[PDB]
Structure 1
Amino acid sequence: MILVFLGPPGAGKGTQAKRLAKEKGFVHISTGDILREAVQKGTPLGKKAKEYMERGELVPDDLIIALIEEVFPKHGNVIFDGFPRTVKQAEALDEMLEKKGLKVDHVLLFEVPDEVVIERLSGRRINPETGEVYHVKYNPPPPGVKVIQREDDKPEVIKKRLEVYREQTAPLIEYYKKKGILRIIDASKPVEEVYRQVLEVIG
């Protein structure tokens, strides 16, 4: 089963993907996580992507399409988390899947208001060592766990990321509606409740 998680930054896509991957057996592909690793390792991809990421802009399509091809599994259960983010990316994904004899089975839209995701992003914290994601209110780190705030989780960058989502990524909702595989998740609820919706959609 191939899943696409679509929705604004901070909707909880990574959080749901990690739990679903562990409990139900999916490979989790997060373009955000992979890009951040590239920046940290100072690869040619990382050095180019950094400037876009830090300003809340999308990384150019050709770079992202290559990234995904590099980590594409042969078949089986996959969650695409934060990919595609543009129509060109969605077209490219369809092509990649086709050449592997695969197709997108469900696109889950994580529907949630901007005020909800602003609080989620502003309070998001990461353990730079384990990569585990926390939230200063909704999932605080335990005593003794050092965390950091991502550079792109600052207020002006959150604003830009949401504008970019509405401009370039939101059109994918109707792209996938036309194909008849879009399913709406209410992502404004607590983690367990969103997870049960995800499981209800995919069975």
Structure 2
Amino acid sequence: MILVFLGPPGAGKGTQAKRLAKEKGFVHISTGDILREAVQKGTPLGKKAKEYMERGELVPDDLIIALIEEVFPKHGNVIFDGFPRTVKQAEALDEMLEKKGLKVDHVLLFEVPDEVVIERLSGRRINPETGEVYHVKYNPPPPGVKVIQKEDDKPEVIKKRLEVYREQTAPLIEYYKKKGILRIIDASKPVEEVYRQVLEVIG
């Protein structure tokens, strides 16, 4: 089974992807996590991607398409989490999979109002070393676990990221709807309730 998680930044896609991958045996492909690793390592991809990420912009399509070609699991279940982010990326994904006799089975849209998004992101804290994600209100980190607020989770960059999402990424909703594979998730609910709905729509 191949899944795509789609929706505004802060919707809880990474949180649910980690949960589903671990419980139901999926390979979790997070372009965000993979890019952040590239940046930390100072690879050619990382050095180029860094400036876009810092500004809240999307990394150029060709870079991301190449990355996915490089890391796509040949066999097994996959969750694409944060990819595709543009129509060109979605078209490239369809082409890649078709060459392998595969397809995207379900696209889950994590629906959540802008106001909730802003609250999710502004309160997001991460463990810089493990990438583990917390929320100052909804899932506070234990004391003694060192967390930070990501620079791209500050008000100005959140605003940009949501604008970029609406312009470039939201059209994927209609792209996938017309393939018949879109399922709707109310991502505004608490974490366990959202997870139950994720299990429901793919079962």
TM-score, normalising length from structure 2? 0.98
Contact 1:5 1:82 in 2 (8 A): yes
Q: Kindly tell me the number of residue pairs found equivalent between the two proteins.
A: 203
Q: CA deviation at 1:148?
A: 1.0
Q: Deviations over 1:38-61 (max 9, x none)?
A: 111111101101110001000000
Taking the aligned partners of 1:101 and 1:148, their CA distance within structure 2 comes to: 43
Q: CA deviation at 1:75?
A: 2.1
Q: CA deviation at 1:131?
A: 1.7
SS in 1 for 2:34: helix
Taking the aligned partners of 1:117 and 1:48, their CA distance within structure 2 comes to: 28
Contact 1:127 1:133 in 2 (8 A): yes
Taking the aligned partners of 1:61 and 1:129, their CA distance within structure 2 comes to: 27
Contact 1:122 1:154 in 2 (8 A): yes
Q: CA deviation at 1:147?
A: 0.4
Taking the aligned partners of 1:49 and 1:127, their CA distance within structure 2 comes to: 21
SS in 2 for 1:145: coil
User: Where do 4+ consecutive residues of structure 1 move more than 4 Å?
Assistant: none
Query: 5+ residue gaps in structure 1?
Result: none
Q: CA deviation at 1:100?
A: 1.9
In structure 2, what is the equivalent of residue 20 of structure 1?
20
Contact 1:75 1:100 in 2 (8 A): no
Q: Deviations over 1:110-140 (max 9, x none)?
A: 0101110111111111111222111111111
Q: Deviations over 1:75-123 (max 9, x none)?
A: 2210000100100000000011112221000000001011101111111
Contact 1:2 1:77 in 2 (8 A): yes
Identity of aligned residues (%): 100
Query: 5+ residue gaps in structure 2?
Result: none
Taking the aligned partners of 1:86 and 1:131, their CA distance within structure 2 comes to: 24
Alpha carbon RMSD of aligned pairs, Å?
0.7
Contact 1:75 1:102 in 2 (8 A): no
Taking the aligned partners of 2:202 and 2:142, their CA distance within structure 1 comes to: 33
Q: Deviations over 1:170-197 (max 9, x none)?
A: 1111111110000000000000010000
Question: Which stretch has the larger CA shift, 129-138 or 3-12?
Answer: 129-138
Taking the aligned partners of 1:185 and 1:147, their CA distance within structure 2 comes to: 29
TM-score, normalising length from structure 1? 0.98
